[PDB]
Amino acid sequence: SSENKLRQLNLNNEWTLDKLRQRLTKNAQDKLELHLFMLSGIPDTVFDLVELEVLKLELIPDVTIPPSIAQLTGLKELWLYHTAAKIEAPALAFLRENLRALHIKFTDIKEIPLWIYSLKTLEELHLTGNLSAENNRYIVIDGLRELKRLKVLRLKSNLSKLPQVVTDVGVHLQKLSINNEGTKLIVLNSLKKMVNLTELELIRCDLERIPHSIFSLHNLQEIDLKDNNLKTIEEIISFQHLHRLTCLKLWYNHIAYIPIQIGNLTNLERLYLNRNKIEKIPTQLFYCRKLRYLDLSHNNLTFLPADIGLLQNLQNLAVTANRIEALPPELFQCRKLRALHLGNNVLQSLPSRVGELTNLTQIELRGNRLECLPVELGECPLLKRSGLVVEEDLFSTLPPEVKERLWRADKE
Numbered sequence: 022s023s024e025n026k027l028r029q030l031n032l033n034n035e036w037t038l039d040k041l042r043q044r045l046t047k048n049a050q051d052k053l054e055l056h057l058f059m060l061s062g063i064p065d066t067v068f069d070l071v072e073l074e075v076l077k078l079e080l081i082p083d084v085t086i087p088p089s090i091a092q093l094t095g096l097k098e099l100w101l102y103h104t105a106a107k108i109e110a111p112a113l114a115f116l117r118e119n120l121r122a123l124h125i126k127f128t129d130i131k132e133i134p135l136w137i138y139s140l141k142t143l144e145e146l147h148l149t150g151n152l153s154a155e156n157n158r159y160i161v162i163d164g165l166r167e168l169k170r171l172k173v174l175r176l177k178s179n180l181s182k183l184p185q186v187v188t189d190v191g192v193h194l195q196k197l198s199i200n201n202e203g204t205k206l207i208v209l210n211s212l213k214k215m216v217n218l219t220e221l222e223l224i225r226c227d228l229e230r231i232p233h234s235i236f237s238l239h240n241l242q243e244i245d246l247k248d249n250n251l252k253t254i255e256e257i258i259s260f261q262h263l264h265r266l267t268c269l270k271l272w273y274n275h276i277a278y279i280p281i282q283i284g285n286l287t288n289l290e291r292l293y294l295n296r297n298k299i300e301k302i303p304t305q306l307f308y309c310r311k312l313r314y315l316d317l318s319h320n321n322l323t324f325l326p327a328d329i330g331l332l333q334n335l336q337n338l339a340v341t342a343n344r345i346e347a348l349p350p351e352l353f354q355c356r357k358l359r360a361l362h363l364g365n366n367v368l369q370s371l372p373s374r375v376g377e378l379t380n381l382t383q384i385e386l387r388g389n390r391l392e393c394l395p396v397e398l399g400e401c402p403l404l405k406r407s408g409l410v411v412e413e414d415l416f417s418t419l420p421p422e423v424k425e426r427l428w429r430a431d432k433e
Contacts, residue, residue, distance in 0.1 A: 028061060036064035048075065052098070057081065068092045077124075078104040091115040100124040105132050117141050122173075126150060130161065138164030145173035152178045159184040172196065179204040183211055191215030198222040203248075205229075213237035219265070224248060231256040236263070243268035251276055261285040272296050272316070284308035295319050295339065307331045318342055318362065330354035341365055341385070353377045364388045364410070376400035386411040399423030405430040 041055065041064070048054045054075035055067065062081065067073075068089035076093070077100040078084065084104055088111040090096070099120060108116070113136055122145035127133055129151065137146075146168065152161040165171070165186050174187065175198040187197070188211045197218055199206060205227035212234035219242045221235070228249035235244065236259040244266065251274035260266055261282065268291040276297035283292075284305030292309065295318040302317070307328040315332070318341035325340070330351030338355075339362035346367055353374035358381055365388040375381070376397030381404055386394075394415050398404065399422070406427040409416065416424065 029065065032060065032062055032064045033066055036060075036066050038066050038069055041066055041070060045070070045073075054098075058102075063087070065089065071095070074098065076100070078102065078106070080104065083107075085109075086112050086116075088112045088115075094119075096120065098122040098124070100126075101132070101134070102126040103128060103132060106134050108134070108136055113139070121145065123147070124149075130154060133161055138167045140168065142170050143168050144170055145175075146171060147173075147175040149177040152176070152180070152184070159186060162186050165190050169193065174198070176200075177202065180206055182207045182209070185211060188212060188214040192217055194218060196220040196222075198224070199226060200224040201226040203227055208232040208234045210234055216240065219243065221245070222247075233259070236260070239263060239265075241266055243270075245270040246274070248273045250274060253277065253280075255280050255282075257286065258282040264288065267291065267311075269293070279303050279306060281305040287311070290314065290334075292316070295341075302326055302329075304328050310334070313337065313357075315339070316362075325349050325352060327351045333357070336360070336380075338362065348372055350374055356380070359383065361385070371395050371398075373397045379403075381408075383408040384410065386415070391415055393418040396420055396423065399426065407431050 044055060046054050052074040053072055054077060055070060055073055056077040058079035060081055062084060071092060071094060073093050074095055075098040076096060079102040081104045084106045086106050086108040090112050096119065103126060117140055120140055120143060123137060123140065123143055124147040125133065127150040152159050154160055162184060163186055166189065171190065171194060173196040174194055177200045179202055183206065191214045194215060194217060197215060203225050206223065215238060217240060218238050219240055221241060222245040224245065225248045228246065231254060241263050242265045247270060251271060254271060254276055257280060266286060267288055269289060270293040272293040273296040276299055279299055279302060281303045286309055288311060289309045290311050291314040292312060293316045295316040297320050299320040304326055310331060311334055312332050313334050314337045315335060316339040318339045320343055322340060322343040322345055324345060325348060327349045329349065332355055334357055335355040336357050337360040338358060341362045342365040344367055346369065350372060353372065356379060358378050360383040362385045364385045368389040368391060371386065371391060371394060373395045375395060378401055381401045387410055394411065396419065398409065398419065409427060
């Protein structure tokens with residue numbers, strides 16, 4: 022049509038290849054992406070960007086995805102933010118055979134392309150918006166069954182319950198992520214069907230108690246229950262049967278204590294308990310002897326038990342913003358430590374045994390009640406001034422020789 026042609030010509034003239042290349046971004050996931058927003062359509066010059074991996078369209082009306090999309094032979098992801106998208110069969114056949122991730126943020130069904138359920142090779146789907154209509158609960162995802170290659174489903178949709186169609190896709194799904202924006206999710210036994218899941222995120226779902234369905238997910242490797250108003254977590258006793266569980270995130274809750282049965286989660290390598298209300302660490306936690314990452318920051322801890330020295334694989338330890346008076350000497354038996362986040366405590370001294378931390382590259386000390394610093398920080402071969410985060414006057418207490426080598430290490 023003549024009207025469409027003139028509008029398209031004008032858009033192409035406004036979006037030269039040089040301008041598009043200046044707009045490209047190497048994004049956080051190291052992917053080459055183009056983001057377009059608030060335009061009248063898609064400039065045809067987009068499809069000369071043959072290196073593109075991610076296309077993001079935001080708030081673009083009346084969009085038609087054209088057959089030249091097949092020129093983007095490395096396109097893997099398409100993001101549609103408030104952008105309805107029409108397509109003909111050649112462009113769709115290309116997406117059906119090559120697109121790996123689809124993100125859609127939508128206001129209502131009008132912004133959901135009916136062709137998305139035919140995207141037979143899709144591995145990830147991310148939906149942000151309400152999934153239901155009158156007499157049509159969860160219709161937006163009824164078609165998930167046809168996405169037989171799907172590995173990752175992310176929903177940000179204020180769900181009262183987990184839709185049955187989700188639990189049905191559990192044979193092949195590997196990662197389920199729900200961000201419920203504080204809407205209480207009721208799980209009630211249906212989650213047990215997602216036997217292939219290795220990663221589960223139930224974020225901001227007002228769970229209050231860890232749901233018992235999780236115990237049936239015997240392939241789980243990682244669980245994240247951020248911001249669910251958890252006060253007690255006795256239910257972790259049943260995690261002892263999840264033999265592949267290596268990452269437990271219960272951060273950002275109201276947890277008042279750590280049950281001793283945490284020590285039977287013996288395959289834990291990363292444990293995040295930061296931003297809770299915990300006052301002490303049970304000694305049984307140190308039976309989690311494969312721990313590499315431990316974050317207990319922003320709790321109410323006064324001391325670290327001597328048994329922390331039994332965590333021989335500990336590499337990153339954070340206890341920021343507690344009220345710890347001193348560090349046990351046994352902490353420095355943890356020879357693999359690389360990072361020690363100790364800020365905003367009430368430390369009065371930093372033990373001389375820090376010199377034994379051969380692999381230390383990062384130590385945050387600010388906001389403590391230190392009068393001086395110990396010379397033995399100079400014994401840490403890999404530490405640089407940029408990794409020693411402390412007030413300048415405290416840094417000055419080190420020997421000039423030590424201070425010289427820390428400064429050099431950065432500039433070398």
